Amino acid sequence: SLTSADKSHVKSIWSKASGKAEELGAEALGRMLEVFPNTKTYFSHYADLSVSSGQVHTHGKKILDAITTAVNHIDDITGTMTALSTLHAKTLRVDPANFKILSHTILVVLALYFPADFTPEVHLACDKFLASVSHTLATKYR
Amino acid sequence: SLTSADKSHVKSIWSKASGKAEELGAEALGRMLEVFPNTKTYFSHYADLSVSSGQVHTHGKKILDAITTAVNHIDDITGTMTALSTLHAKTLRVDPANFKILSHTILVVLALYFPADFTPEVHLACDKFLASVSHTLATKYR
Amino acid sequence: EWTDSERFAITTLWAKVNVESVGAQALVRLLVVYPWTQRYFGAFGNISDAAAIAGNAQVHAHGKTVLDSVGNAIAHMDDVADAFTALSTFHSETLHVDPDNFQHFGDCLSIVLAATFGTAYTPDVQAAWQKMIAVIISALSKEYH
Amino acid sequence: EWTDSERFAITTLWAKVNVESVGAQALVRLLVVYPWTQRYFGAFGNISDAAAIAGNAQVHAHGKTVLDSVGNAIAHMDDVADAFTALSTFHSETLHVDPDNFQHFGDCLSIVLAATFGTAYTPDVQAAWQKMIAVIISALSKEYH
Numbered sequence: 166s167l168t169s170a171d172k173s174h175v176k177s178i179w180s181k182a183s184g185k186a187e188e189l190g191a192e193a194l195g196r197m198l199e200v201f202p203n204t205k206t207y208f209s210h211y212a213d214l215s216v217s218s219g220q221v222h223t224h225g226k227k228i229l230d231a232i233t234t235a236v237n238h239i240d241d242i243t244g245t246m247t248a249l250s251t252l253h254a255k256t257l258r259v260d261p262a263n264f265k266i267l268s269h270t271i272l273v274v275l276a277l278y279f280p281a282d283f284t285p286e287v288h289l290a291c292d293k294f295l296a297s298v299s300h301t302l303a304t305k306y307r
Numbered sequence: 308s309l310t311s312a313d314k315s316h317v318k319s320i321w322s323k324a325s326g327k328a329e330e331l332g333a334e335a336l337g338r339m340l341e342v343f344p345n346t347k348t349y350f351s352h353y354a355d356l357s358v359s360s361g362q363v364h365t366h367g368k369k370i371l372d373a374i375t376t377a378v379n380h381i382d383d384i385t386g387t388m389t390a391l392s393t394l395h396a397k398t399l400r401v402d403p404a405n406f407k408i409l410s411h412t413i414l415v416v417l418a419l420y421f422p423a424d425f426t427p428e429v430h431l432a433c434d435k436f437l438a439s440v441s442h443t444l445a446t447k448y449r
Numbered sequence: 450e451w452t453d454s455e456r457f458a459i460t461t462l463w464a465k466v467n468v469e470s471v472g473a474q475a476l477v478r479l480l481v482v483y484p485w486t487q488r489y490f491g492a493f494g495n496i497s498d499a500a501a502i503a504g505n506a507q508v509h510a511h512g513k514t515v516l517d518s519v520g521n522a523i524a525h526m527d528d529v530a531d532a533f534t535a536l537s538t539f540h541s542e543t544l545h546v547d548p549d550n551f552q553h554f555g556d557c558l559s560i561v562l563a564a565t566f567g568t569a570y571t572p573d574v575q576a577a578w579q580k581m582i583a584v585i586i587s588a589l590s591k592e593y594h
Numbered sequence: 595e596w597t598d599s600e601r602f603a604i605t606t607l608w609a610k611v612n613v614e615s616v617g618a619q620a621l622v623r624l625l626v627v628y629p630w631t632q633r634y635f636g637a638f639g640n641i642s643d644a645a646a647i648a649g650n651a652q653v654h655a656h657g658k659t660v661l662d663s664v665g666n667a668i669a670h671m672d673d674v675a676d677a678f679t680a681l682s683t684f685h686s687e688t689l690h691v692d693p694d695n696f697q698h699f700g701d702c703l704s705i706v707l708a709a710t711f712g713t714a715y716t717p718d719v720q721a722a723w724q725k726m727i728a729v730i731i732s733a734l735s736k737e738y739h
């Protein structure tokens with residue numbers, strides 16, 4: 166249910182952003198933790214949860230690279246995220262209600278850093294996309 | 308993401324229930340309308356929204372028969388409901404936040420009428436199933 | 450604001466609820482149908498499959514505790530938010546429970562009441578119980594800020 | 595309960611919000627990203643595609659009205675539920691708006707504030723605005739019972 170236009174839009178902003186994978190991922194992760202403090206417990210093993218934290222930098226890059234992988238395989242998001250679905254469900258035990266929270270902070274960060282490119286249609290596309298990534302990450306939960 | 312076991316469970320309760328398609332559908336629809344009164348506006352063209360209403364009986368049967376169609380094509384729910392997705396999105400303009408409400412009242416009615424057969428695993432199966440029907444009905448909304 | 454009819458639907462049905470049976474059934478369903486919720490209840494031991502959940506004595510005991518608290522909400526039904534302040538804070542700040550799970554539990558409770566009461570759980574009676582559930586959920590979600 | 599830091603994050607950013615621009619942008623996004631919401635706003639005419647939405651004068655005017663109401667919530671931030679009673683009732687009983695859409699709108703508003711303020715919308719400032727949004731959403735959802 167991503168259209169051709171949606172995929173074009175997602176690939177466009179992603180192409181314009183993916184050079185800052187680490188900064189964007191650190192900001193989205195940091196923001197999730199501060200703005201939605203119910204999520205802190207999952208990262209409670211880190212000494213610092215701020216955006217300046219080295220562990221947040223490292224982990225933000227992983228998030229954003231995994232999302233890039235999905236953009237690059239945008240016709241098989243199910244496939245690209247199935248391993249990560251198992252990990253979140255079975256190892257990490259992340260309540261899947263949290264996936265929309267990180268999806269939201271990623272959009273916030275895209276708007277912050279790329280406000281001209283993050284038009285309402287691009288926003289639509291990206292929201293569809295992260296919804297499909299979230300649906301895929303939830304697939305192994307039950 | 309329905310397992311073999313899930314499909315067995317769904318087909319089982321459905322086989323045990325589908326003889327009361329009309330009563331069950333009238334009860335689920337009536338219950339949605341009374342218990343979640345924000346949904347009444349969509350059926351405001353009916354003179355009577357009670358479970359005894361003939362228009363609710365008629366429409367309940369349609370709902371339940373459409374769900375039976377999905378049970379009978381349980382490996383292609385996307386396909387079975389795509390026409391109905393277009394209808395709800397484009398003609399009827401039903402806010403897709405309501406789909407979970409009817410899903411819930413259908414489960415309530417299954418439990419009411421078939422409490423021995425609606426075990427916790429069957430409930431799981433049926434909840435997965437109605438979630439997939441709801442996801443499918445939402446597919447054409449954007 | 451409650452109507453007399455709503456108050457009556459709630460207190461008459463409540464007078465016939467076995468809080469052990471209904472509470473166990475409701476929590477069993479929560480843990481089977483929404484199995485990610487199992488993460489919040491590590492203290493119970495093995496709750497990783499349906500049969501283990503349904504026979505687990507700690508699940509049963511906890512389900513009764515929850516249904517007793519629903520009884521407390523009913524006794525405070527004119528202001529459940531105030532009465533549930535500490536409990537809300539507890540589920541937020543100590544347990545970190547995502548509030549969508551209160552909705553999941555409420556759904557399981559309505560289902561269990563339907564299964565338990567059959568045709569007596571009429572549409573009006575269900576509507577009153579859904580309102581009660583919604584008020585409980587809102588009270589439990591409140592101290593999330 | 596607000597911290598002084600939160601109060602400050604809210605009132606300093608608010609002092610620089612153009613309610614016409616931010617309010618129009620936020621409602622545009624609502625109507626484009628969640629297009630089912632277009633059903634609630636028939637009075638605006640053609641709002642069925644992005645370009646039509648973005649240029650529609652009535653959308654712009656309405657977006658300003660919404661952002662002015664956010665300003666009212668801020669002036670009543672110690673009790674937005676009380677202040678938003680009529681407004682909540684209106685969106686429930688007259689308009690029948692499913693409350694999930696308040697969350698959608700809040701998300702669009704946070705996004706717009708990020709786009710508008712850039713690096714000034716720091717994580718702490720966003721956290722305070724998310725709390726404010728949550729309090730507005732809760733106030734608008736309240737008279738659903």
Ligand code: HEM
Nearest residue numbers: 204207208224227228231232249257259263264267268298
């Ligand atoms: C868009 C959604 C998400 C994606 C793409 C994503 C991606 C990832 C990736 C790539 C890893 C690393 C796995 C490894 O190195 O082997 C991971 C780990 C993790 N994820 Fe997520 N994740 C998402 C959502 C979430 C959410 C919402 C939470 C919690 C609120 C969460 C909590 C974690 C935790 C706790 C780890 C382990 C981190 C560590 O130990 O350093 N994830 N995730």
Ligand code: HEM
Nearest residue numbers: 346349350366369370373374391399401405406409410440
């Ligand atoms: C499981 C979810 C649902 C299914 C399977 C379903 C199925 C159907 C079917 C089969 C029709 C008849 C179409 C025809 O005769 O051509 C229909 C119509 C309709 N649906 Fe749904 N529907 C669902 C959810 C909803 C929800 C949640 C609402 C509103 C709250 C809704 C409102 C309507 C309305 C207003 C009509 C037109 C009814 C009439 O004019 O008599 N539907 N639906």
Ligand code: HEM
Nearest residue numbers: 486489490492514515518519540544546550551554555585
């Ligand atoms: C109507 C909904 C609920 C009510 C009325 C309720 C009530 C309670 C009560 C009374 C306690 C005991 C508090 C004490 O120690 O004094 C409790 C504990 C707990 N609740 Fe809830 N609760 C609800 C929903 C949930 C949900 C949905 C979850 C998780 C998904 C949850 C997780 C817990 C946990 C983890 C504990 C501590 C259990 C332990 O003893 O180890 N609750 N709850």
Ligand code: HEM
Nearest residue numbers: 631634635637659660663664685689691695696699700730
């Ligand atoms: C933060 C969220 C929102 C606030 C603060 C807000 C505020 C307002 C205000 C102040 C009005 C004008 C009331 C009057 O006439 O005195 C209004 C009208 C309206 N609102 Fe909202 N609202 C919000 C969200 C939404 C959402 C999400 C929807 C639908 C998806 C909605 C649909 C409407 C409609 C249909 C009207 C009447 C429009 C007309 O003039 O034709 N509102 N709202």
